[PDB]
Every structure is written in C-alpha cells, then in structure tokens.
C-alpha cells in the first residue's frame, strides 16, 4: 500500500487504532501481519 499523510497522523497507521484516518480513511486488521514504513518528505512533496 502507498499514500501520503501529515506527520501528526502517522500513529493511526497501525492495527487496533482509533481516530479519523483509522475510522474513515485507512485501517489495518486486528491480525495485521506486515510492516509499516514511513518518512517525512518535506523536501519532495
């Protein structure tokens, strides 16, 4: 999966989370078997 979010939102990209991204945009399963990879892109985006 690939997307961009503001730096405040990144904690929502995890299993079992609550918040507007987790509820209404993008959600990971309770048995999510994977890795989350992220970086700031302020010199690019």
């Amino acid at each position: 999966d690939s997307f961009v979010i503001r730096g405040d939102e990144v904690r929502q990209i995890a299993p079992g989370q609550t918040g507007k991204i987790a509820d209404y945009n993008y959600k990971l399963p309770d048995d999510f078997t994977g890795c989350v990879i992220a970086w700031n892109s302020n010199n690019l985006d």
Binding site: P15, G16, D30
Partner: protein, 49 residues
C-alpha cells in the same frame, strides 16, 4: 449431631459452589471484574490483554 455426615456433604457442596460464584467478582489484575466495564472503557487491544 448424630446425622452430621449427610449435613456435611450438603454443606461442602454449597460452600464449593458459593466459592465458585464469589470468584466471579475477583479482578485477577484486570482493571475490573465487571466485564462490560473493561470493554466500554478501554481500546480493543488493551481490553483483550
């Protein structure tokens, strides 16, 4: 007191079942033994743990 054996077998079973009921109230280190007051209070990962 002559009939004590039979009365004691009733007493022991009542005492065992009452102990098994009273143990529903014990917390075992969880925030409360009222099961809905874990679920209604915590986030799902914390509630499951």
């Amino acid at each position: 007191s002559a009939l004590g054996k039979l009365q004691d077998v009733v007493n022991q079973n009542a005492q065992a079942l009452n102990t098994l009921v009273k143990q529903l109230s014990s917390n075992f280190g969880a925030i409360s033994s009222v099961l809905n007051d874990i679920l209604s209070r915590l986030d799902k990962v914390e509630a499951e743990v």
